[PDB]
Amino acid sequence: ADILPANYVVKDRWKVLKKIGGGGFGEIYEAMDLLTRENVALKVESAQQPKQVLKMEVAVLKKLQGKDHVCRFIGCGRNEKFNYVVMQLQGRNLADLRRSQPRGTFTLSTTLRLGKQILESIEAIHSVGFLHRDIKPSNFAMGRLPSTYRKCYMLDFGLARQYTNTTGDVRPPRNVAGFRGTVRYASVNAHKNREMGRHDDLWSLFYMLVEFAVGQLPWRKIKDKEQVGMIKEKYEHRMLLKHMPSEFHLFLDHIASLDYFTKPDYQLIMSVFENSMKERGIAENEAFDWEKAGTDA
Numbered sequence: 001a002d003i004l005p006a007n008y009v010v011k012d013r014w015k016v017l018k019k020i021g022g023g024g025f026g027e028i029y030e031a032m033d034l035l036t037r038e039n040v041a042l043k044v045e046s047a048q049q050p051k052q053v054l055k056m057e058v059a060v061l062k063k064l065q066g067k068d069h070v071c072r073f074i075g076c077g078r079n080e081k082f083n084y085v086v087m088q089l090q091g092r093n094l095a096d097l098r099r100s101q102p103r104g105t106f107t108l109s110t111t112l113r114l115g116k117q118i119l120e121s122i123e124a125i126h127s128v129g130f131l132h133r134d135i136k137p138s139n140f141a142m143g144r145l146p147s148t149y150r151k152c153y154m155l156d157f158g159l160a161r162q163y164t165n166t167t168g169d170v171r172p173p174r175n176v177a178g179f180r181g182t183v184r185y186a187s188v189n190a191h192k193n194r195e196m197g198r199h200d201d202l203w204s205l206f207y208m209l210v211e212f213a214v215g216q217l218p219w220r221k222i223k224d225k226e227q228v229g230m231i232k233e234k235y236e237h238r239m240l241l242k243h244m245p246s247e248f249h250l251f252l253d254h255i256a257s258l259d260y261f262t263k264p265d266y267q268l269i270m271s272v273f274e275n276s277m278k279e280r281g282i283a284e285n286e287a288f289d290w291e292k293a294g295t296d297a
């Protein structure tokens with residue numbers, strides 16, 4: 001069934017406690033690090049599996065080491081049965097935290113402050129020549145330590161693609177590129193099976209923040225890829241912002257203006273979040289909604 005059993009020790013060092021995630025791609029375990037005495041995340045991929053994707057995931061994670069909002073890399077390896085990566089263990093993902101909120105909504109305070117962090121992570125992965133291509137709330141996790149629990153960390157590079165060649169140029173888009181990310185947060189371009197660009201990661205961010213602040217997207221009950229693309233294509237997006245800060249029109253109009261070839265104005269989007277906080281007197285060091293101060297006073 002699973003690749004690693006319960007109590008399996010990888011490289012004499014990382015001992016499986018339980019499976020915390022998995023699909024077609026590979027599986028993710030919580031492990032005890034026998035050297036450091038710390039719990040770690042262990043992600044594994046079958047050595048035979050026809051698509052060898054973990055190799056690319058580790059390469060991305062390694063390039064990003066030293067950026068904020070990135071899991072600390074601990075180790076990786078390869079044998080006859082599986083490839084694996086060991087990374088610092090984070091806490092709960094934003095989909096789990098949003099569904100724990102009484103109405104499935106975050107405050108503007110939580111929404112805007114998570115937005116700044118996710119924006120920073122998107123620019124970071126773009127800055128080392130990669131698209132995420134599956135930006136969604138379950139791919140961000142809060143830290144679990146006193147130094148990290150107010151930090152949001154980007155996970156799961158399993159659908160990432162290098163958008164540059166080996167010498168830093170933007171590579172030519174394929175005329176058709178089959179979109180295989182999550183329906184709910186996919187850009188209209190993704191829905192049309194266009195080559196995805198940096199802008200398409202920022203669309204996914206746009207839709208996440210609306211959904212955080214409002215509790216839902218208009219197409220939430222529709223799972224069909226094609227039906228959802230047809231709804232988004234027609235949807236008057238300025239209407240998503242009816243109950244959002246007016247600065248979010250600057251965000252919408254910007255990413256609407258972008259194409260596959262054009263570098264986003266990340267600072268423009270950051271200033272939207274920053275101006276939206278400043279207008280409502282929102283301080284950076286406020287409790288997140290899920291904290292004792294956040295779930296109380």
Ligand SMILES: CC(C)(O)C#Cc1ccc2[nH]cc(-c3ccnc(N)n3)c2c1
Nearest residue numbers: 021028041057088089090155156157158
């Ligand atoms: C960055 C990389 C190597 O591509 C990755 C991943 C990934 C995918 C799916 C996952 N599901 C849950 C986690 C997870 C949970 C807690 N703490 C950490 N570091 N992860 C998780 C991590």
